[PDB]
């Protein structure tokens, strides 16, 4: 009869950025799916693999909330298949996902005039990461000129690059609160259920 | 680079318990599930359990339920796997593995530990 | 429970030579087969994850193939680093269970 949360992974007050997205597992539920229907304000919702009308009536093995704030255009990098920087340095779905990407519009809460400097994400690696990787080193990056000892000169950058949100920048260059819902549907004991 | 540096060999009588360790540092140990697993020698590997450590969940199987008991440490990022009620079954070497994506396989692997049980 | 059943224990060759090894599963495990590799001081590391060919960081002699219940692995051309013992695997349903092992020596 314990509801589980939802006001903790979805209307909390800061979230954090894309190079380091958050992770709540969530178990033991009775998983009411019908707050996240009854707005208005979620502007993308889509749901891969599972139609966003039986979600009230499926149990699975666990639920991922993953969180970040990306740019307006980058909502359609959270997807399987898509490249661009968002889904091939920061965080990657695989193929066979069975979730529901879902990204409301906070231009509200996430901007001031002068800047937000607090959002980053990565410019350049070495390889694309592998599905749900996370990595966080910010050290001063390899990129060439093979001594490299620290100073940052030519031919080396740092690998973040932070967001300029303002209110005045159109759709675009907004922040957009993704939360990646992401089921587990393992064949095993039923956790959350409906 | 990411590694799984996991502990020497042991020693132990029948009766006693080890208290096994995997020490994961080169990505985040508290997002992704840790699965234990074990080889007797000349055969396959076979599955103990997992643990997730952001809450502290445990996926055992029915064979090892009892005898075979996880828990993890978030700030010392490791894990650990408590055999209690030993015998001469257990003289097995013990692996530990993990990957972000369990559909996709188990990516990083340990080394393994080679437990021998007599007097 | 689903139990893979590896066909063999030992298979043997020489260099230059094409070698598949089977593996066939009980169920319909519906393409979500591994395959690994270990050297016999100890050390194991994965060399395709899905069933479909998608290899994580290994030289691209290594491709499977199969679907259904009947899977194989299987290399191009092998060398003295080739030398395992390769496991199967199942991930759609709990107990992982592995397979046998086939190992390899040079004939």
């Known amino acids: 009869t314990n509801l589980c949360p939802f006001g903790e992974v979805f209307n909390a007050t800061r979230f954090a950025s894309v190079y380091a997205w958050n992770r709540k597992r969530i178990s033991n539920c009775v998983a009411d799916y019908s707050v996240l229907y009854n707005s208005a304000s979620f502007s993308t919702f889509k749901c891969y693999g599972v139609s966003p009308t039986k979600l009230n009536d499926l149990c699975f093995t666990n639920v991922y909330a993953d969180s970040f704030v990306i740019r307006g255009d980058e909502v359609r990098q959270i997807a399987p298949g898509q490249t661009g920087k968002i889904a091939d340095y920061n965080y990657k779905l695989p193929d066979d996902f069975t979730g529901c990407v879902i990204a409301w519009n906070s231009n509200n809460l996430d901007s001031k005039v002068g800047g937000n400097y607090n959002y980053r994400y990565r410019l350049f690696r070495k390889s694309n990461l592998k599905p749900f990787e996370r990595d966080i080193s910010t050290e001063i990056y390899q990129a060439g000129s093979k001594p490299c000892n620290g100073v940052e000169g030519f031919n080396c950058y740092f690998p973040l690059q932070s967001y300029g949100f303002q209110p005045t920048n159109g759709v675009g260059y907004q922040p957009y609160r993704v939360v990646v819902l992401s089921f587990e549907l393992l064949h095993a004991p039923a956790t959350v259920c409906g | 680079q990411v590694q799984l540096q996991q502990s020497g060999a042991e020693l132990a009588r029948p009766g006693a318990s080890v208290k096994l360790s995997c020490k994961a540092s080169?990505?985040?140990?508290?997002?992704?599930?840790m699965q234990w697993l074990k080889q007797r020698p000349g055969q396959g590997l076979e599955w103990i359990g997992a643990?997730?450590?952001?809450?502290?969940?445990?996926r055992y199987t029915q064979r090892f339920k009892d005898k075979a008991t996880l828990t993890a440490d978030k700030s010392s990022s490791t894990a650990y796997i408590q055999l209690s009620s030993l015998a001469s079954e257990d003289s097995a070497v013990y692996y530990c593995?993990?990957?972000?994506?369990?559909?996709?396989?188990?990516?990083?692997w340990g080394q393994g530990t080679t437990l021998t049980v007599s007097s | 429970d689903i139990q893979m059943t590896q066909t063999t224990s030992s298979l043997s060759a020489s260099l230059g030579d094409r070698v598949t090894i089977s593996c066939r599963a009980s169920?319909?495990?519906?393409?979500?087969l591994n395959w690994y590799q270990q050297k016999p001081d100890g050390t194991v590391k994965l060399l395709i994850y899905?069933?479909?060919r998608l290899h994580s960081g290994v030289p691209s002699r290594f491709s499977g193939s199969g679907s259904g219940t009947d899977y194989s692995l299987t290399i191009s051309n092998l060398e003295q680093e080739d030398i395992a013992t390769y496991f199967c695997?199942?991930?759609?349903?709990?107990?992982?269970?592995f397979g046998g092992g086939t190992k390899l020596e040079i004939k």
């Open positions: 899905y069933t479909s």
């Open positions: 169920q319909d495990i519906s393409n979500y």
């Open positions: 695997q199942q991930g759609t349903t709990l107990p992982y269970t």
């Open positions: 593995a993990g990957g972000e994506y369990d559909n996709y396989g188990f990516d990083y």
């Open positions: 080169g990505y985040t140990f508290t997002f992704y599930w």
């Open positions: 643990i997730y450590p952001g809450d502290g969940d445990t």
